[model samples]
Target: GRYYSSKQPYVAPNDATASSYSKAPKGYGPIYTESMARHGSRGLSSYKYDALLMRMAETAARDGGFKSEAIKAEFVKNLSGITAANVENGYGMLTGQGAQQHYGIGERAYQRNRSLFDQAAADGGTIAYQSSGEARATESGENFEKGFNEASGGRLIGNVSAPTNPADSGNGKDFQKNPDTLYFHKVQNPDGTSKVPGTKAYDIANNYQNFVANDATIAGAEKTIGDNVDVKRASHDLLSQIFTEEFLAKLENGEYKWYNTTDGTKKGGKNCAPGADASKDPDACGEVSKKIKSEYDAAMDLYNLYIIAADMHNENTGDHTFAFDQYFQGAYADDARMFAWALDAEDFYEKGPSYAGQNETYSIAQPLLDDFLNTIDARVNGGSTVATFRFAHAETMMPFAALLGLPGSTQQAPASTTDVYTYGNNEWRGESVTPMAANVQWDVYARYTPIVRMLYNENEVPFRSECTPVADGSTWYKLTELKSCLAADHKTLGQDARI
Candidate 1:
């Protein structure tokens, strides 16, 4: 019944109207604002889950694995439809719903800070935009800019001016890629393409690559969930709904297998041309003939699709409507929940608050935090940039939130291997921490003194408990107070990363 973990769509936790937001103290008015957002709902990053699932379904239909002919037809129809939608939308790119999410956030940003933007327009202030340079993130920035400009009655000048694609159209001349700050987790090109060596992103990725992959403590922490999730049992339950017991047994016994032909091992396996008759072509990309090696993977293939379908609900068309909802409801709801826990566990260890007393999981986000502080400092010190916007991925958001000790991201697992992070003991739910289009924003108000307020998912919230606010119950804090407080608290998190 619930949208699967991080695949949940964006839902602004509080009203975006001016009345819901706190007003600045006497003589103070908003001067500058900055935000970091995970990209809006997107299709599978590549032709992954849906492609694999479609192949599995095709194999099952041919092998008499389906519970019934009608069920087999329905499953293929649903899987193919999802695939077709992704193909049309462009794999790994934002869907219609995703674009709308950023657009609305942009519109509300203007609505909430009308006076600041208006004054900036009169005073020649400008807005800067940045992205991880991945297509989805870049597209999200474009949509946000459009919404911001449109909502302001064309008063604000926001643009997308990258060095390589310099047809700079707006007043702000510095829209560019910043993968090192925004996408430091992995070593990839600034555009988020193939791995490139000799850069900050490469170095950070190199530094953490081994630790994330081979760390014994992480392995042990994962083991604690072994008793909590019965993947085998859950897999069996879910697979049985669409497939027959005999077929499930065959998969269990390794009699049935399927793998991507494009992976270079399968001969005559090549991707069919777009819009071709894949049904008649066994060599078609994603056609399952000889590979996915286990029952768990088979079940997970479907689980992944079920979750992403939640985000793509808006992009559904006549030929490609999502029907995976049927597999995760009523009888199979618990299985879905179990898989969510299993899925979330991976991120919890790799990107979130991992073992207590260890900071490697989130320390890489230091550059991004530095940017946040410096941007605020620049505006406070009479800089002309009135606002900044950044778009990236869940991978970027999760680690950054954990690094900042934001709510739902603070608790860490005990040092002991036996006791570990779990839903019962921790508040770090993926859906809450880094759901589709999730965002964290900072708004600065100034006069003689500058004050700051933070918004997590558009809801005004307090900083970590160590930082005191301007008033007893106010969410706002003096700029100087926040920098000092957060710095001191951050050092205690294990790395001095005070860039």
Candidate 2:
């Protein structure tokens, strides 16, 4: 139900039900904790999607083609603007918001588990961090350090420097040696092709291609509005949708100014007063702004593609602003809804738990799983640190989620259908599973049985069926049972193994 855009950047849900769930069950005060987090919200990885969309719009406008030709020119104009900004920033780098997300997460993690930080403050333990070799990853890592510093009152007792290379640590090479260790059957896709290092390949499915192509949203604007955006263009849908949500939120929070539209006659704010009318105010609601929702899907592609050639347009093109407007409705959301399915479906099959007969998708994740458990095994007892944090990409987060078989991530997306994937179709939903800041935390406890309190993105998570817990229905589980339950050999699992 938490539908935004499939490629939507991740953030924890408003529903933080577990935020107050039972405080560190007595005798389970934290010893050591470790986490692997994905970087926060970001621009689409590259201009290819933006470029493709742009090319399509430009070609259509230049030829003066199909439906509503009048809107085509201006739409193309907006896209041109977004394209330039995209190119100027390029892709694979974090946006300003991304840095903030990590900072917030780091601070919050410390706050929620303040006991651990308090212990760190008293013991003056050393803290360690690791990150893959990527600009965004490193940036997010530093931001977390800032957050940790803020939470600890700058008392974290260690030097924060450049991120370590996991590959050189022997962990990265171990993953490539066996892709299954990466996640729940990570690479082999429905196409009969697998992206894993040792896996043979297969072709992808036509159902996926056709589903998003069929249309976008549930309770969305009319099909006439959202459907023009294509299935193959899921990335565009995500870029537009996430930004739109951010824009609306920023507007409501008074962080957005220059233009305010609150049914024409709303109150004023520190930034700007509200004015209900979409008319007269040129910056308010022009014809172009009203159609934002309908054209959103296409605009994303157009902007991204155009951005690749940053110099093509002056850096100030306005497509980025144009992309987030509040006019989309009905099926207008469907194109994205549908495209999201196609996208998640691939992730499910490739990086997550694929369809019923596919188990290897998560098998390759074993080695990485070994890495996590092995680290905890060695450090929980004698390590001189309150926690060890890691920053990585969605590529790792997805499979890791599957490898752990976290709720909502354990199921495979069904075969492509006219309808978008949802709780009704299956438990897998992108919004909750891998939003930006997606993470998994292991809070180790030393009681009679020695247990672990697992948190997935700050919310407690469930373990595989065979893993026995501290109580009949408690979220806490015996670390011993879990070690064996997740197939502790650090190598492989039988077909039915859950995590």
Candidate 3:
């Protein structure tokens, strides 16, 4: 049989307010001042409620830590007998119900375990609780199981070979030792080799003998070819014998006479017409002709050397040492050589009226003079000759000065304080003095030599200026003054000043 329902006597309150409130209530009693018993049932007794709470409290405080089967059975019995009212009413009331219950328990626990709580707080511990059954089960069961297994031998299966204590091992494990193991190799040496195996002595003796021998043989051959040898000297004995005043006079006259020929005209051999005798007689020419011939030959050799030195110093050597060497060897001749070489180098064998002007000496001399004038012009026009000259001078003479302990200024001008006249007034004066700046008037006169000579010789006109004095002076003199001076000088020389 199943018992499904129960009946109990109900009662109303004794207070006037409660009674009136109960009576006034219609379908649902007074709606306010009524108890559960008033709704036709007797309420639970305080003793019974208290007894239920005692049972719940006992169940909550059961020995959950004991793992035996008997203790587990007692836990189940206590859990089954508990009720919510038992915990909330009886033990909860005794412990100061609601929030006060938690406060009271916490205070008691703190007072009883003050030292332990202080230690845990000092060690950075904080109190927490798990409310859900799942969270509590995870923390207590899974986490605890893992820690326990690690403490015992359960987690040691794969880590058997790993060190338990590193300090006990002499050679500790390293994470990155021998990182370049793939390329590492040990050196192997042969027996009887020196202890210092890679020394130069061992290398030369064993590996480089043949190479050294070949290099030495080749160097010897080069030295043999480059050795200096003097082969011949120019035939002219005295320098004056190589150049004569008569040859220079002829050159001056020929300069004016040759102008018409260069202009491509057939002015016979005369100054202004055809069929006039331009040739001077052999006896009248005499020793002057022979002297001119000799000077021409000497001048040709000097001029050739000048061309070679200019090429070598300017383009090949860069340091004018080669030019200086050639100059010291008497390779450069005086201005007389300019006139002489022109006659000697004339291409006479070639024939024709066309070649006639070309055979004459002055015809050839003009171009050579033009080259010298152009070089001077370039230097005056702010070109690089000054710097080149200085650098080459230093390179050429410095080594010799050092060897001989010479005191001359090689690369720079002599200092102002230096008295170059101390060694005989004229001996070193020329070398020590700074060269004069080029004068425009002098330069023009120099360049106009051929023109001026032509005007005087052919026209029988007085020289407009004295060639020697004007050529040496500042180049800024007035053209009128120069021409007047030349005319005066020409009148004085008369026929002797021709060309």
Candidate 4:
């Protein structure tokens, strides 16, 4: 359960009630605030994992795979309920818990920077928000706006408008769309639509594909994971909970395998349409296959469902009472942890600090850093906007954190095929680095010289070790000094001559 990794729900690192923040130096008061946040807890991005499980469960029922009648009934009930919940909530939309997470974050933003927001209200400055243009990200922003407006007593209204391309002309709503800044790794929208040519996002997307395909180190690392993990034993252990020993032996011996239809589309095949009623069309889903090529993938589909259930607890009433936890407890917990480590290792290589001396994994995030620095400069130099908020995905947050050299994201794996990243060798944990709704915020204070303070997940943390603060052991830094130091440090690591 602790190994939920990046799927873990948002939990403030520092106390939300206690006044734990350091006071601004004399003659200085808060002016403007900004943040880059990962979207809150959400339903499955599509009709995935859940459909995979449903397909498997259907196979089991047909083959008499259940251990007992009661287990069979409960499993069917739970799977059906979970699928209906996703349909009712819409695939990839934010859940009740996700909306609540953003609301609290927005409310806390106001409380933490009350003086600055208050001054903005008196001075007639409005708040600005941006999203990655994905439905989940946009909904998360709307929820945050709700929380902030309610907390501020409607003093400052957020300019809530639909997303427009960053290159488009100005609109009445202050909200802007910039996928290059927020979703650098994507070439298409969530629904598989193509992005416009000649955009920075398109360029970055091409670059990312090249890096993942041609990089020898990344390829070697992925192979190393395959060689090290024991997927057969783990998968057997997990599936054995509800199915009889004979049923698992069939899976192990390649006697049973199935494939469901992709994305609920009506493809001309024997595969099942996602969310279709089983009683009405019992023979509609999942074509049979002779062998299961990889036990790891089969287990992973179920594991994903197990962890996501944690985020949907708020919706677990009546028909949607998901008991996914029951499948991964007691003897099965160790198998869950094994799968979690496998997921963490892949993310570590792809997004977090990869092999030592490599920056390709995070270099694409430079544009985001550029935007963050420029926003502060604008506010410090008389910009009217009181606050700026950006909402995006884990793919955006992970690399951005590494580029900034934030805590738990600074270490790189040693350059040895035999010795790759592991919990023993690296301190990075997805649960801490980019959990659901994870964020990094910068608060600016000024009299004449502007100073900056950073909050990682609501805890005031100092900048990277190489950059000296305004005073020794102080979390605050002068803006000029901070910029110069960050640029110089980044340059040493072979990036941004000027940040």
Candidate 5:
């Protein structure tokens, strides 16, 4: 929960069992288990952000009175030569590591629940896979197929990743191809600009852009510095913290070779620019060598570009190239941490618990929850699908989490300073709520009646409050009670209340 930066690469939290783990009741076994996951790690979506960073480097190198000569030289040598080159990869696609993660997920799923998969392999029953119809999901699904099949020693059969809902624009379609959320827009404005200037989407995007404006890292550097060195240089230091120390070290191997440091020098690390001399001036560089650090932490919003940029890096090479990118250190880590809150401030209103009376923030996820219960019911009533896995983005993940009342996703952030959403009042963590490979799973077991177990990112969590456990202090939930607890009420569309 206390990761330095949300943008940093993360290992999915491990599932730990109690020292005295109890066995399942007689005749109780998982018949089917469903997993809904975010896609795996990826590369930068495009070169635009990387280009912006390089452009700044270009400007600093061209101008003199440089705060750090080694940094300036590194910019001129490495960044300048790369000016013409597009950021490693521009299009949104999965990397080799993405394949590895999905394969691992599938392999692990089969390993942990051998009976469910072995039943399918032995009986020649199907092991069905579904995706959001986007590239990463598609590729992840294929890799998973390899893992699931091999785990069964090649007994598994059929097109594992058939689209559960392929229709382009309805509930009948793949969620990614046609979500009710993403393209939630109306007709064209009078000026013909798709951006209507004042919608909720526009407002969030606006806040995102404005949060970086005149960031404190620039003007306040003198006080924090232990100096009145060039304020412009200070600003870039804060803005540039998006790169990892390791990333900077790699860059060091290239242009910043002149700068040296001992911190994780054998490992990936940051370059202390200007060598020993300029760095000696506490007034000049704040004695800071790595990361986009500052007294101000909210500046993290500016670094989102870098946090995301690494994901879509060039895939032509080995997976290692795309393996790491998030590197928040020193003062920059604070900004990264603060910016995470900044980003959620909008989400608090738009996607989560914004309005005291409104449910739209979490209600959109209602359909998916209903789908989960419906599928489990049908399986118990003789449905053929072995498992139903729905893959979508954070939009689907967080709101759905909120709807389920997962610990942190339930708090209502306020509009004022005192009540502003923070780590103090709320438990919602951007990294845990949704990260690469983030998933929510429901494992259905049966005895006389169906029982359910829930996993948020592979760790068991309770079902809704009204649903009772299958056994005292056990994760297993009563399927019927859960269905009742989570029953979907309805209203005629455009009506005031649920019918």
Candidate 6:
């Protein structure tokens, strides 16, 4: 029975309903004669289809040569590699389909050429992205389009349509009207006070803007202020005043005489009168001490001026601040080391007069020293007061020694510890003939700019180049190689070494 039921399985008729659902009404005919009656020709012409194909082919051809090898190579050479890639990608991405399909071959070539030409003009080099190459390229392309449209006798057609009213131009008026209003008002005081009726305010604002715009002028004025201002100038002048003739005389005749005469005798022959106690004061210091201070002050002034100049130069270039803060924070450490060295030198001179002869070997020379001391006395002391004048003599000598390229590594005269010298017998005697020790490390002096800057006179001298010598032979040798070797060698070492 089941086999018999499978006869020819019920089949549905192959009518329009079985083939597909009908959206037309039941009365609609298969010929579509009624639809044809209502409309005119709605099909594309054979010529229009052929024209579209030609346009597509032309677009593909132009895209193939868009960024040719020659263009890319020129770009690579001028701008950095990364910048060049960015510009190339930007051009391709912005052009989109228009560059490939819509534009004719001639028009596309003109566009690409204009883009490159404009890039070359706006940017220093066509390849470099340093300037507004992209903007210039866009502008050139727009200009090219305008010329192309005028020459082609064809108009670009899209969303914009013609106006209905002859008198009313519908170019953009049909769109929403956007109104912009600008309001400017000055606030009044509660007391109703009005602005001063003068051009001074406007002048001041203009000048301020000008100063901000021109970096060089601003930097120059800042430098002038720093150099001429009394606070900074006074410090410099004081240091110079301390390094004059009269001061040197007092040191030679007073301190040096006592040290020379008392040498080998009890108290290490430091028997020279310890100069007047008041020689410590700027006003007293005998003639020699006063002279030394004055000269030292002058030198300090020059040093300040040099720093100001360096600062101004750096500022105009949008560089780091190079003023007192940087000097104190970064360079003071080295200054401290130099100060210790000067103290050691003074001690060496006192300990053994024989070594004192080396003082003459200093580049500053004895005459300069004497002159410095004399200047100090003439300006500051005027030969009236007297004080110990210990700090002035010792500290001034450090910068002077640096300027001279002296070789003493030890602290100046005053030893690191009091036990190094015994004061019991009214004669300052040392427990041993050992050289004075410096509390601070000499390497610090070598690294800091205050000392290095002064010594090299703003030359590009390395800090380690100077300080390493004071540590050991290894350090000294390395520094020597650095100084003597070629730039490549130095660069390699800089990369490889911990320094």
Please give the lDDT score at residue 399 for candidate 2. 60
TM-score sort, best first: 1, 4, 2, 5, 3, 6
Q: Model 3, 1-499: lDDT tens per residue? A: 0100111111112344222211111121100000000001111111222122222223223422223455334433332222222222221111111122122222322332334334433443322211111111112212222332333324221221222322112222101111011001111111112323474333423332233234432234223212212111222221223223443333334421111121212332212111112241111111111111232333333333333222121122222122212222344233323222221112111100011112111121222123223434543453322100000011112221211112221122122222211222211111111111000001122222211211100011222234322223322222233333333132232232222
Write down the TM-score of every candidate. 0.88, 0.65, 0.14, 0.87, 0.65, 0.13
What is the C-alpha lDDT profile of model 4 across 1-499, one tens digit per residue?
Answer: 4678888899854464326788877788888789999889987665556666666677778889899889988887887777767666666778998899999889889888999888787877767788777767777777887888899898776433344543223321344666778888878764345667787767777787688779888778777775564655787677777888887777657776555554222352454435655444343334433123345666777787877887787766776677777888887887777778778888888887788887878877878888888988887677787678998899999889888889989899988766888877788888889988999999998885588899988878888877666665678777776667666254222122112
Poorest stretch of ten by lDDT in candidate 2: 282-291
Candidate 1 C-alpha lDDT tens digits along 1-499:
4847999889864453435888777777788899999999988765556656666777777778899889988888887888777776667778888889999889888888889889888888878788787777888877888788889998776322234431133422244777777778887644426446776667777788778998888888666664344767888888888999988888789777666555313463654424535443222335435355667777777888888888787778776787787888886888887778777887889898888878888888878888998988888777888888888889889889988889999898888677777678888888889988999999898775578889888877888877667767778787767667667353222122111
Better of 1 and 6 by lDDT: 1
* Best model per TM-score: 1
Q: Which consecutive 10 residues in model 3 have the weakest lDDT in total?
A: 30-39
State the lDDT of candidate 5 residue by residue for 317-376, as single tens digits.
442232112334554455445555555554555565543444555665665676777778
Better of 5 and 6 by TM-score: 5
| Residue 436 displacement (Å), model 1 | 1.2
Candidate 6, residues 83-133: lDDT per residue as tens digits? Answer: 122222221112221122112322322232343223323333211001011
Ranking by lDDT: 1, 4, 2, 5, 6, 3
* Candidates 1 and 5 compared by TM-score, better number: 1
Give me candidate 1's TM-score against the actual structure: 0.88
Error of 4 at 165 (Å): 5.3
Q: Which stretches of candidate 6 lie over 4 Å from their true place?
A: 1-289, 293-328, 352-499
Local distance difference test, each candidate? 0.76, 0.52, 0.22, 0.75, 0.50, 0.23
The reply for model 3, stretches above 4 Å from the true place, is 1-303, 317-480, 483-499
Residue 89 lDDT in candidate 4: 68
The parts of candidate 4 lying over 4 Å away from their true place are: 13-18, 158-174, 190-195, 227-231, 244-256, 262-292, 488-499
**Candidate 2 lDDT by residue in tens digits, 1-24:** 324433444455353664675555
**Predicted structure with the largest lDDT when compared to the true one:** 1
